[PDB]
């Protein structure tokens, strides 16, 4: 997470991020819409940060410092590079829409009027197919990853010291290994709530209301597909047990 | 400071997201109430014991039966929520949420929490519910449901005014520490 984006999203809301003289130029309904869009982008920035802690802090530290077998590290952090690729691209598109909307002479005053089209693009076509494939794989490997982590923490001294060392800083308080895995699993089910609330305050332009209505439907289709493609993998569960899920 | 994990379950309109937000900030937001809650690790000292209590929401997972149980592994205490302004949310507790939590979290204490207690004597709430032949949940109806489901205890709170919020999480911490 770079300083520029952290500072742009430091405030608890859009209404506290923009200059108060700029805030006063907008209707109440536009303020409400912008506050929810700001929450979507700020939580996406945090989710991309969670994925960077998993790839750079945990995964790479285990490979370079503990010299763990790539297969063990893969079991602990399944699909992390694919997940990071999906969300860093989506975050880049969100931040570019904000950057283009900035008033000349300002690095904080903006209004995003056309989010719907960006959401339709993210949740349709090849990007939706990749999100569905990646989350169906990740969520099916969730239980296996937590069990593999617990076994390593309890039986390997160097692994326990590594974890305690890299998770000691206060900035990592909410981001232990298991915490990162659940943060990532829960991310996809936050989108409908955020989109529906943005839609609630986007009736001013009929085309925007229609675009968000389509986007909400696409996110729900994606979640139903992922939910239907999940089966918890279990190391040691013989094929005789797969049949009764 | 031992680490304990708390998960809140309940219907979409039970107020679980707001309860987590108000507790974690010790404040009902004055400018913007967030739509979602990511996670939080609260430092709580209850009866002389210091605990790091990790908090998790299940909001948005209600329609996904294979995604939702991924929130449950290693849970130490469950907050099972209903809204006092919604007798329908209380009816869904014994045969939807309770058998699910007992399956994925066997032997984990469950605290039944009646949220939005400030709406029990709200005239707009009472007029609205009377159209569907209903009324705000009474404290004894909450206690009887908690007794029926084998809850560890029954508690009420209001995220709006903060009354009872600290008590709910301090009791959850005590329940998470028990054998
Ligand atoms: N006071 C700022 C504010 N109020 C809101 C109500 C609903 C949605 C967003 C909102 N932002």
From Swiss-Prot, chain A:
Residues 32-229 form the DH domain. Found in a complex composed at least of ARHGEF2, NOD2 and RIPK2. Interacts with RIPK2; the interaction mediates tyrosine phosphorylation of RIPK2 by Src kinase CSK. Interacts with RIPK1 and RIPK3. Interacts with the kinases PAK4, AURKA and MAPK1. Interacts with RHOA and RAC1. Interacts with NOD1. Interacts (via the N-terminal zinc finger) with CAPN6 (via domain II). Interacts with DYNLT1. The modification N6-acetyllysine is found at residue 150. Phosphorylated by AURKA and CDK1 during mitosis, which negatively regulates its activity. Phosphorylation by MAPK1 or MAPK3 increases nucleotide exchange activity. Phosphorylation by PAK4 releases GEF-H1 from the microtubules. Phosphorylated on serine, threonine and tyrosine residues in a RIPK2-dependent manner. The DH (DBL-homology) domain interacts with and promotes loading of GTP on RhoA. Promotes tyrosine phosphorylation of RIPK2. The PH domain has no affinity for phosphoinositides suggesting that it does not interact directly with membranes. Activates Rho-GTPases by promoting the exchange of GDP for GTP. May be involved in epithelial barrier permeability, cell motility and polarization, dendritic spine morphology, antigen presentation, leukemic cell differentiation, cell cycle regulation, innate immune response, and cancer. Binds Rac-GTPases, but does not seem to promote nucleotide exchange activity toward Rac-GTPases, which was uniquely reported in PubMed:9857026. May stimulate instead the cortical activity of Rac. Inactive toward CDC42, TC10, or Ras-GTPases. This is Rho guanine nucleotide exchange factor 2. It is found in: Cytoplasm, Cytoskeleton; Cytoplasm; Cell junction, Tight junction; Golgi apparatus. The gene is ARHGEF2. Induction: Up-regulated by bacterial peptidoglycans stimulation, such as muramyl dipeptide and in biopsies from inflamed mucosal areas of Crohn's disease patients. It is linked to Neurodevelopmental disorder with midbrain and hindbrain malformations: An autosomal recessive neurodevelopmental disorder characterized by intellectual disability, speech delay, mild microcephaly, midbrain-hindbrain malformations, and variable dysmorphic features. Changing residue 191 to A: Reduces phosphorylation level, normal microtubule localization and activity. The chain holds residues 206 to 448 of 986 of the full protein.
From Swiss-Prot, chain B:
This is Transforming protein RhoA. Its EC number is 3.6.5.2. One of its GO terms (biological process) is cytoplasmic microtubule organization. Keywords: ADP-ribosylation, Cell cycle, Cell division, Cell membrane, Cell projection, Cytoplasm, Cytoskeleton, Disease variant, Ectodermal dysplasia, Glycoprotein, GTP-binding, Host-virus interaction, Hydrolase, Isopeptide bond, Lipoprotein, Magnesium, Membrane, Methylation, Nucleotide-binding, Nucleus, Phosphoprotein, Prenylation, Proto-oncogene, Ubl conjugation. Changing residue 45 to K: In EDFAOB; somatic mosaic variant; decreased Rho protein signal transduction; decreased substrate adhesion-dependent cell spreading; decreased number of stress fibers assembly; decreased cytoplasmic microtubule organization. It comes from Homo sapiens. The modification (Microbial infection) O-AMP-threonine is found at residue 35. SUPFAM superfamilies: P-loop containing nucleoside triphosphate hydrolases (SSF52540). Its main location: membrane. GTP binds at residues 10-17, 28-35, 57-61, 115-118, 158-160.
């Amino acid at each position: 997470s770079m300083e520029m984006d952290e500072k742009d999203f430091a405030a608890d809301s859009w209404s506290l991020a923009v200059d108060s003289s700029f805030l006063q130029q907008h209707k109440k309904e536009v303020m409400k819409q912008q506050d929810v869009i700001y929450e979507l982008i700020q939580t996406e920035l945090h989710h991309v940060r969670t994925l960077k802690i998993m790839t750079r802090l945990f995964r790479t530290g285990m490979l370079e410092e503990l010299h763990l077998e790539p297969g063990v590290v893969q079991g602990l952090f399944p699909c992390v590079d694919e997940l990071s690729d999906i969300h860093t691209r989506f975050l880049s598109q969100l931040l570019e829409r904000r950057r283009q909307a900035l008033c000349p002479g300002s690095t904080r005053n903006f209004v995003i009027h056309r989010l719907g089209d960006l959401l339709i693009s993210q949740f349709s076509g090849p990007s939706a197919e990749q999100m569905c494939k990646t989350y169906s794989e990740f969520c099916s490997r969730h239980s296996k990853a937590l069990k593999l982590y617990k076994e390593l923490y309890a039986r390997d001294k160097r692994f326990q010291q590594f974890i305690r060392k890299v998770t000691r800083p206060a900035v990592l308080k909410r981001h232990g290994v298991q915490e990162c895995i659940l943060l990532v699993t829960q991310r996809i089910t936050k989108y409908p709530l955020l989109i529906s609330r943005i839609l609630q305050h986007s009736h001013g332009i009929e085309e925007e209301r229609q675009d968000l209505t389509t986007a909400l439907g696409l996110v729900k289709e994606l979640l139903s597909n992922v939910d239907e493609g999940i089966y918890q993998l279990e190391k040691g569960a013989r094929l005789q047990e797969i049949y009764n899920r | 400071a031992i680490r304990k994990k708390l998960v809140i379950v309940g219907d979409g309109a039970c107020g679980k997201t707001c309860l987590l937000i108000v507790f974690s900030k010790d404040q009902f937001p004055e400018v913007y109430v967030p739509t979602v809650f990511e996670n939080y690790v609260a430092d709580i000292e209850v009866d002389g014991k210091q605990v790091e209590l990790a908090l998790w929401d299940t909001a948005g997972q209600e329609d996904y039966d294979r995604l939702r149980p991924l929130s449950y592994p290693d849970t130490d205490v469950i907050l099972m929520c209903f809204s006092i302004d919604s007798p329908d949310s209380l009816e869904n507790i014994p045969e939807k949420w309770t058998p699910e939590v007992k399956h994925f979290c066997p032997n984990v204490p469950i605290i039944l929490v009646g949220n939005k207690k400030d709406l029990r004597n709200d005239e707009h709430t009472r007029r609205e519910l009377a159209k569907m032949k209903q009324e705000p949940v009474k404290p004894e109806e909450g206690r009887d449901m908690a007794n029926r489901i084998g809850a560890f205890g029954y508690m009420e709170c209001s995220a709006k005014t903060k009354d009872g919020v600290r008590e709910v999480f301090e009791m959850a911490t005590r329940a998470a520490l028990q054998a």
